[PDB]
Structures are given as structure tokens and as C-alpha cells.
Amino acid sequence: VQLQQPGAELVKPGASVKLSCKASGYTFTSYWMHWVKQRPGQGLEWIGMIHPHSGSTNYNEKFKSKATLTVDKSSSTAYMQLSSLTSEDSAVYYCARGADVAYWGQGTLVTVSAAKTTPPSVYPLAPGSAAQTNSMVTLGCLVKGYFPEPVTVTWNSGSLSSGVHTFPAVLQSDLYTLSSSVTVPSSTWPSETVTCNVAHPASSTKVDKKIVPRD
Amino acid sequence: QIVLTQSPAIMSASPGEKVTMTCSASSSVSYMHWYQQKSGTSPKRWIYDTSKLASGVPARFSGSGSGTSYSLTISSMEAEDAATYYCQQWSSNPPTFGGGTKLELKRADAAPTVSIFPPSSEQLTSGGASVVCFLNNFYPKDINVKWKIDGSERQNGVLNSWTDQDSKDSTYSMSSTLTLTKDEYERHNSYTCEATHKTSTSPIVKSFNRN
């Protein structure tokens, strides 16, 4: 069966961590398992490998210290792990198998940062009254001042179909921040209900926050 | 040991057209491999043993691979073929992964609608105040986004983000920001932003002066 590794993972710098990789109650102790670093927008770094029969590890030089590999012949699982890490160690890692083949795992994201669970600062966005001269005027919810991903946005809930371009988080100052935007006719918002259901599964807020002009 | 390298880092290509990228090594190398990520989710088993294709690969593909410099070649291009690709290397003692070629569709040059949105009510009860340009559905990629507080071409303080290849809209969009306090913003006036596109090397911009 195709590989499995757990949810997402988060860290305080200069600390350690146990990352899983489970497989079948067979095919297990026979297959050469690797691990790979990818740091968003990074290429690919082969860290060491490890064998499940023997349990022989083989780290890549430039990690030998930081990283270590191991296995549990029983639990049909192979836990690679890492200690003392940087906002820079912060990346996504996957184990995998296969001769000529590959068939990877869904990978796992890891986050090296210093704050904790901030509910977001949620501001809305209206133009300098048709200062953007268009027959269809543009609109946005800003979600600044936060740190535990992920943040979700829906405009007047999942009511909105298209021209609903949502942006990726730009973490900075150890704080996630991202900005979405919708577009609609000078028929629509001028005089219509447009909330945006900004949301968080850390803080658990549905900061459902409406929008009109006039500042 | 043995570093691999992708030919064009990025690459725009319309459908139909044949295209080819390349890996090119620090060594004589036996087989050669290639994988295809599609943003966010881990790469797929794509090309192995220099020209052997993983099942489920469309045949549009072809693994050339000469001792030390190797190509990857697409015959006719489809939409699916939109993605991003790398080259493996079984045969170094520590196995290495290629640069990363990125593919995208050539589209009809489209300009961008550029929305700018002065700082909200709340932000002012919070001082550190901020302003967004929202430049949407445009192509191609080239974009000299820049702001200009009081015509002064502001270098720092900027936060850019950019979606890719609007699966539907087939084009990009890029919400950049900008920040200070109440203060040193009370400061400068003419709080405006300009981008520069491939089509309209006659530059287009949305400005602001309020009060």
C-alpha cells in the first residue's frame, strides 16, 4: 500500500522531533526506505536511508549530525527523526521505496518558529469609491497577525463562485499573513450583503466580517 | 557528489508544440530519472531508466539520455503536461536531485486589473498600517511591480505573494502589500503603486492621495 505519514508538524527552535512513516503488516522489512527534504520552493535533498531487516542506516554527510534514522520491526513503521532545528530546517519531508520505481508518501510539513496560536487581525478592503474605474469593482479580506496555519476564507461563506483569487500565506516576523480578493459588478456589492467568512481551526473563530464602503 | 542541472529553469509553452528540457551532470551516469511535481503535493514516479516510462505516463514523452547530458522531450503539449520536473541519480554514492524545470502554458498576453485598498478602520486603532495592490489574471509572467510613495521608488517593507496558473483563468495574480505606523506614513503623500507588463511597456498604475 502507498505510504502514510501523519498530519502537519510544528517546532520551537533548538529542539527535537519524532516523525512517522507507517507501512503494511508485510512488504515491510524488505524495502529500502529513504527520506527527502524539500523547503517550500526548494529542490530536493536526499537525506540518508535505512533498511528494515538489518536496520542499517546511511545518512548523507551534510546531515549526519542533525538527523538520525530508525525503525520498529513490529509496528510496521519507520521513524526518522530530527533534533535542534532552524526557521531554516523548516520544510516538508517524505519517506519512499522502490527498485527502479518510486511511489512516494504524501509528505509532511514541518515548521520551525517561535510564537503560539494567534487568532488573526481581520481587516476588509473597499476602493476609493470607484477610484478603480471599472464596470465591476474589486474587493478583499486581509488576514494579518497570525502564526498557526492554515487559515481559511470564504466570502459571505462558500457562496462565491469565481474571480475569487486567494493568496498564499506570507510568513514573516514569525507571523503568517495572507490576503484574498473577490471581484464583482458595479451592480452587486454597492448595495448588497457581502460578508467574508474568515476562519481558523486553531483559535476556532468564525470572524464572519461584513463589507461596505465609506471607510 | 555529482550535481545535476535542469536546462530552462522555467518554460512557457502553448499546446501542440514539441518541447524539451535537459539534465546535465557532473559525471558519467548510467540510468537517469525524472519526477513531476504538481505544486503542493509530492512528486510522482515519472521517468526512470533513462527512457522507461512509469505506467500512467502519457506517451507524449521520451527519455533521451547521453552518458552525461540527458534530455526530456515532450512531443505534442497538453494541459495536463502543465507541471514541474526534476532529474534523479541512482548511481552516485549519495544520490542527487536535479534543478527543477517548471512548465506553463503560453496564453494570449493579458493585462492585469490592479486594485489598491487604503488601510482599514481597525488597522488605525493598531498603528502599523498597511496597503494592498491586487493585480489579477494577467500573462505572461514578467512583471516589474513597484510602488512609489511620493514618487519615491520605495525599496523595502513590501510583501509579495503569487498564485500560479489559475486552473480555470489559466493565468496569475499577485497581492503585494506595504506597511508603517500611523507615523512616517502621515509622513509621505502620493501613496501609489505601479507594475510593468510585457504588453503595455507603456506602464499602467492605480494611484492615491487622499487628503
Chain B positions touching A60 (Cβ under 8 A) are 94
| Nearest CB neighbour to B117, from listed A36, A60, A140 | A140
Same domain, A17 and A85: yes
Q: Determine, yes or no, domain membership for A201.
A: yes
Which residue of A lies nearest to B37 if distances are taken between CA atoms?
A43
| Nearest CB neighbour to B113, from listed A94, A126, A138 | A138
Same domain, A56 and A125: no
Please calculate the CA angle B103-B109-B114 and round it to the nearest 5 degrees. 105
- Best residue in A3, A179, A210 for a mutation probing chain B (most B CBs within 10 Å): A179
Q: Does A119 touch chain B (CB under 8 A)?
A: no
The string over A121-134, giving b where at least 16 C-beta atoms fall within 10 Å of a residue's C-beta and e elsewhere, is bbbbbbbbeeebee
Place of cell 503539449: B77
Same domain, A103 and A143: no
Same domain, A106 and A163: no
Q: Determine, yes or no, domain membership for A84.
A: yes
Same domain, A78 and A160: no
CB atoms within 10 A of CB B172: 23
**Domain boundary pick from A112, A138, A159:** A112
CB contact under 8 A, A102 and B54: yes
Please calculate the CA angle A111-A166-B81 and round it to the nearest 5 degrees. 85
CB contact under 8 A, A127 and B117: yes
Which residue stretches of B41-126 are H helix?
Answer: 121-124
CB atoms within 10 A of CB A120: 24
Same domain, A62 and A96: yes
Report how far residue A193's alpha carbon sits from residue A208's, in angstroms, rounded to the nearest whole number: 12
The CATH 2.60.40.10 domain(s) of chain B lie at 10-104, 113-206
How many separate domains does chain A show? 2
Chain A positions touching B162 (Cβ under 8 A) are 167-168
**Domain boundary pick from A112, A146, A163:** A112
Report how far residue B62's alpha carbon sits from residue A45's, in angstroms, rounded to the nearest whole number: 26
Task: Indicate the DSSP class of residue B150.
Answer: T
Q: Determine, yes or no, domain membership for A181.
A: yes
Which of A99, A34, A104, A107 has its CA nearest to residue A69? A34
**Deposited experimental method:** X-ray
Same domain, A138 and A107: no
CB contact under 8 A, A142 and B120: yes
| Topology of the domain comprising B113-206 | Immunoglobulin-like (2.60.40)
Q: Under 8 Å CB-to-CB from A20, ≥6 apart: which residues?
A: A4, A5, A6, A77, A78, A79
Q: Determine, yes or no, domain membership for A196.
A: yes
Report how far residue B211's alpha carbon sits from residue B189's, in angstroms, rounded to the nearest whole number: 9
Same domain, A190 and A105: no
Same domain, A100 and A142: no
Minimal Cα–Cα distance from A172 to chain B, Å? Answer: 9
Report how far residue B61's alpha carbon sits from residue B55's, in angstroms, rounded to the nearest whole number: 12
Cβ atoms A81, A70 nearer than 8 A: yes
Length of chain B: 211
Cβ atoms B20, B77 nearer than 8 A: no
Minimal Cα–Cα distance from A56 to chain B, Å? Answer: 15
| Nearest CB neighbour to B163, from listed A104, A106, A165 | A165
Cβ atoms B174, B113 nearer than 8 A: no
Q: Which residues pair with A137 in a beta bridge?
A: A184
Q: Determine, yes or no, domain membership for A169.
A: yes
Between positions 51 and 90 of A, the ones with CB within 8 A of B are 60-61
Length of chain A: 215
Q: Under 8 Å CB-to-CB from A138, ≥6 apart: which residues?
A: A127, A132, A181, A182, A183, A184, B113, B115, B134, B136
Regarding beta strands B10-12 and B101-104, do their DSSP bridges make them parallel or antiparallel, or are they unpaired? parallel
Report how far residue B62's alpha carbon sits from residue B75's, in angstroms, rounded to the nearest whole number: 8
Same domain, A195 and A130: yes
Which of B30, B15, B13, B17 has its CA nearest to residue B67? B30
CB contact under 8 A, B42 and A140: no
Distances from the Cα of B197 to the Cα of A100, A130, B68, B140, B145, angstroms: 45, 23, 39, 8, 9
Q: Which residues pair with A16 in a beta bridge?
A: A83
Report how far residue A148's alpha carbon sits from residue A206's, in angstroms, rounded to the nearest whole number: 15
For residue A106, give its domain range: 9-112
Place of cell 494567534: A118
| Nearest CB neighbour to B43, from listed A104, A162, A181 | A104
Same domain, A46 and A76: yes
| Nearest CB neighbour to B130, from listed A44, A104, A144 | A144
Same domain, A108 and A200: no
Place of cell 509579495: B160
Q: Determine, yes or no, domain membership for A215.
A: no
Please tell me the CATH superfamily of domain B10-104, with its number: Immunoglobulins (2.60.40.10)
Rg (CA), chain A: 23
Distances from the Cα of B50 to the Cα of A71, A132, A161, B24, B94, angstroms: 32, 53, 44, 13, 19
Q: Does A207 touch chain B (CB under 8 A)?
A: no
**Domain boundary pick from A69, A84, A112:** A112
Which of B175, B171, B164, B168 has its CA nearest to residue B83? B164
Q: Resolution of the deposited coordinates, in angstroms?
A: 4.0
End-to-end, the C-alpha distance of chain B in Å comes to 61
Task: Indicate the DSSP class of residue A193.
Answer: -
Between positions 139 and 198 of A, the ones with CB within 8 A of B are 140, 142, 144, 162-163, 165-170, 172, 177-179, 181, 183
CB contact under 8 A, A183 and B136: yes
